[PDB]
Amino acid sequence: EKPNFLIIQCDHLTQRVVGAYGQTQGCTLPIDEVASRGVIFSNAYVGCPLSQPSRAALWSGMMPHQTNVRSNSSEPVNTRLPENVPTLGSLFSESGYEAVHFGKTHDMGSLRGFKHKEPVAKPFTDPEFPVNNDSFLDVGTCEDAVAYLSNPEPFICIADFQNPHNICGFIGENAGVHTDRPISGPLPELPDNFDVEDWSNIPTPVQYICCSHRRMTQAAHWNEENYRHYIAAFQHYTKMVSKQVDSVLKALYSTPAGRNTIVVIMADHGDGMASHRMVTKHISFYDEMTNVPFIFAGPGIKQQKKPVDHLLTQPTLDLLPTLCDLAGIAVPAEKAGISLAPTLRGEKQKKSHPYVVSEWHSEYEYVTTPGRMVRGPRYKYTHYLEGNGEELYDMKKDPGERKNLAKDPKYSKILAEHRALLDDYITRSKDDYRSLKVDADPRCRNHTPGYPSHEGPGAREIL
Ligand SMILES: [Zn+2]
């Protein structure tokens, strides 16, 4: 019998908060239970740390400059994926699967082939944290997926949850200098990489996220207590969505279809979680935002106690071929992803990514400051057109990315070697990166570098 698939994706969800990754306890027990039956990938980099580019890319198995959906802007700034591009939904539908999608779309046409049902917001009251339509829509999504799974073959079902994206609304309610609303639970500690060591040693676009990113403008002058309350809220919205994941899985396993279902849990991108002073996602490529949870379990998938760290994976590219392989569906040769089904099955992985990549372009076209990330087996390299800025982090010895090695002459060979990987990427993927124009108004680079120095309203008000 062909397997069913349930893909659960949570917007902003991070490795740090998912207990299976070993950093934070107590926030994701239902996800951790799935992980404990299957396989989790340590190195799972998304193609862009932003929702619409990530999703347009994910469901088509392509990179953002190829879909040409490079920001969150709507039509005509970004155009829907052409109907001739194969997608996860087209491939599965054409192979006899019922393909259904619940929850957040934000796909710019890459969900073609799925039958989508729009969720309806179901409001509720939270006595300690701000909640908004992000959280209320998730209630509807959960109801929809529960109803579907409680009476389902073969099928592929996506449940696209918003949380912990309600962190964005939290930041708005706590913008600027403020005293935090008291909460009852423990107040988390700041991460080891909270502080930026040296602002002069990071790229211009990253130095001025306070100017270009509304949420960073709002948090720029936050104190340490303020950031700790941010982390608490992030954990709270994570717990909230984890309860919905539990409800969805209970529905799945309530009929005989469940045991024949492969479950995937992932995120479109992560969240700064105060690391590098960052809130949410914008411009930078640090692991908190680019390296997401990527968990599989189900029939034929052999349990692995240890996270898989010997492979570099790219969910944005790899999900489509992995699911097709598990379903016995031929993948178009042009798709650049690499099926992980052999690793999942305990069979020989004959092909793997030598490196993985992420992209930045713009958020809403106020500031266009393209960049690229290359994660090799050990080091992460970043480049930004603006100022020709570069980063180089030793991910083995400096997993917090505190120490930029790009200007250290001891690392000049390593730096060259990673520039060369970017060159290979640009060639093979037909990236127009090197020809792109920076549009970064000097008004958004007009104070001493770094967020504590930020003055004034930021790009969306000034430009
Ligand atoms: Zn600023």
Curated annotation (Swiss-Prot):
Residues that bear 3-oxoalanine (Ser): 51
Superkingdom of source: Bacteria
Pfam families, per the entry: Sulfatase (PF00884)
Enzyme Commission identifier(s): 3.1.6.-
Region called Disordered, residue ranges: 438-463
Protein's UniProt keywords contain Glycoprotein: no
Signal peptide (residue range): none
SUPFAM superfamilies, A to Z: Alkaline phosphatase-like
Record flagged with keyword 4Fe-4S: no
Enzyme class, UniProt record, top EC level: hydrolase
Annotated Zn(2+) binding sites: 210-211, 447, 454
This protein's UniProt keywords: Hydrolase, Metal-binding, Zinc
Reported cofactor(s): Zn(2+)
Biased composition (Basic and acidic residues): 457-463
Post-translational modifications reported in the UniProt record: The conversion to 3-oxoalanine (also known as C-formylglycine, FGly), of a serine or cysteine residue in prokaryotes and of a cysteine residue in eukaryotes, is critical for catalytic activity.
Cited InterPro entries: Alkaline_phosphatase_core_sf (IPR017850), GAG-degrading_sulfatase (IPR051849), Sulfatase_N (IPR000917)
GO MF entries: arylsulfatase activity; glucuronate-2-sulfatase activity; metal ion binding
Family according to the record: Belongs to the sulfatase family.
Function: Exosulfatase involved in the degradation of the glycosaminoglycans (GAGs) chondroitin sulfate (CS), dermatan sulfate (DS) and heparan sulfate (HS). 2-O-sulfatase active on unsaturated non-reducing end hexuronate units. Has a slight preference for HS-derived structures. GAG-specific sulfatases play a key role in the persistence of the major human gut symbiont B.thetaiotaomicron in the host gastrointestinal tract.
Protein name: Delta 4,5-hexuronate-2-O-sulfatase
